[PDB]
Write a protein that binds this ligand. Structure first.
Ligand SMILES: CCCCCCCCCCCCCCCC(=O)O
Ligand SMILES: CCCCCCCCCCCCCCCC(=O)O
Length: 130
């Protein structure tokens, strides 16, 4: 299975600044990163996922298997042990460092929402070729 597989680019996001401050991203990275339309690549093979998030020269590669412990490297570089689960056939759901993350794919549009307390960091991304 490869439902999620592809290359996507950020179209818009909400509460980037407030969220990145809350989790502790260096101020200069908040400022450089706020208007970057980053590119995310996902390669799915059944339950096995590999994904890359690129923003300028910052490249973060991660991997997980649905249902198994994984170690996710976050935007600060902090690596957190968690589990990623499937919710329905179009969502990827996880919690790391008290952040609840929901990744939802609808055709060519991935909506990613990260919630830390009352802060909801929403990203909308669109497929950009193969
Ligand atoms: C030197 C270039 C500056 C790079 C700093 C920008 C990186 C900051 C992170 C912004 C992208 C947010 C990634 C969200 C991850 C996700 O929701 O899947
Ligand atoms: C920031 C640490 C990694 C995020 C943890 C979520 C793990 C499951 C989802 C992986 C696919 C993420 C693609 C998001 C698209 C985007 O907004 O850039």
């Amino acid at each position: 299975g490869s439902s999620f597989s592809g290359k996507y680019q950020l179209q818009s996001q909400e509460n980037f600044e407030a969220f990145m401050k809350a989790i502790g991203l260096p101020e200069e990275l908040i400022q450089k990163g706020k208007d970057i339309k980053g590119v995310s690549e996902i390669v799915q093979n059944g339950k096995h996922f590999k994904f890359t998030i690129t923003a300028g020269s910052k490249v973060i590669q991660n991997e997980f298997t649905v249902g198994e412990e994984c170690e996710l490297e976050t935007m600060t570089g902090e690596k957190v042990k968690t589990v990623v689960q499937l919710e329905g056939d179009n969502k990827l759901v996880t919690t790391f460092k008290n952040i609840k993350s929901v990744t939802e794919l609808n055709g060519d549009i991935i909506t990613n929402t990260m919630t830390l307390g009352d802060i909801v960091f929403k990203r909308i991304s669109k497929r950009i070729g193969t």
